[PDB]
């Protein structure tokens, strides 16, 4: 995240950190995700697309730091990895970029509620906030496009949703953005999501609840003028989500 503040998981208790193992000894970070229900985490298919081996991923809940342990964290293996059939990538955009990971702990259970682990609410069918709404995004992604390392502390920032009309302007993204995507930017192009934040949540308040309105998906550069970050519009995937959850 460019800009933002450093935070702790108590502030984003539904954020999930997904790592990949290289038995060479290291486990590296892959993407973020959100806990929908005790056994299901939702992320982005593009995070897995290249190495769809569920057995090598580890999911942690209740984690405030990237490579050091947080007291209260839970570790899970991925029992099912559901990528979106029809996912497609082009020169920028990812289409149908949503994935579901069913988690199981070594004891055979799903997540348990604590002060650092909570689910986030889903929107109702095709129900979104109106452009202008401020939502927050969280993650362990880069702090600057030139960085080649990810921060160790979890960060968060607030961004505003913009209309499709604004985002589909030719000098923004044109038609690369569809109705199944949402764009969000900082009025001052000062804060934004970046490489490493893919899969994490775009949370807004909808009908009184903190709702998972988008999934961090793509964007040209990070915190660039007229280049908002694009998110998968969760409200348009509700049937898909239910067919599997």
């Amino acid at each position: 995240i460019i800009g933002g503040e450093f935070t702790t998981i108590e502030n984003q208790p539904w954020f999930a950190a997904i790592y990949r193992r290289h038995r060479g000894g290291s486990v590296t970070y892959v993407c973020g995700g959100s806990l929908m229900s005790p056994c299901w985490v939702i992320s982005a298919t593009h995070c897995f697309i290249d190495y769809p081996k569920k057995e090598d991923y580890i999911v942690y809940l209740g984690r405030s730091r990237l490579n050091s342990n947080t007291q209260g964290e839970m570790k899970f293996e991925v029992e099912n990895l559901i990528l979106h059939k029809d996912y497609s990538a082009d020169t920028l955009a990812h289409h149908n970029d949503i994935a579901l990971l069913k988690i199981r702990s070594k004891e055979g259970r799903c997540a348990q509620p604590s002060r650092t682990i909570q689910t986030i609410c889903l929107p109702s069918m095709y129900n979104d906030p109106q452009f202008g709404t401020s939502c927050e995004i969280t993650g362990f992604g880069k702090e600057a496009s030139t960085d080649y390392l990810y921060p160790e502390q979890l960060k968060m920032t607030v961004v505003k949703l913009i209309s499709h009309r604004e985002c589909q302007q030719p000098h923004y993204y044109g038609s690369e953005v569809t109705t199944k995507m949402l764009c969000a930017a900082d009025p001052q192009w000062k804060t934004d999501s970046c490489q490493g934040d893919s899969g994490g949540p775009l949370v807004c308040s909808l009908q009184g609840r903190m709702t998972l309105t988008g999934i961090v998906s793509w964007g040209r550069g990070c915190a660039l003028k007229d280049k908002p970050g694009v998110y998968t519009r969760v409200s348009h995937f509700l049937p898909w989500i239910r067919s599997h959850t």
């Binding site: 108590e10 502030n11 909570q118 709702t211």
Partner: peptide
């Protein structure tokens, strides 16, 4: 005890 989606506190 049980989850309450969206609730931090």
């Amino acid at each position: 005890l049980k989850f309450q989606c969206g609730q931090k506190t």
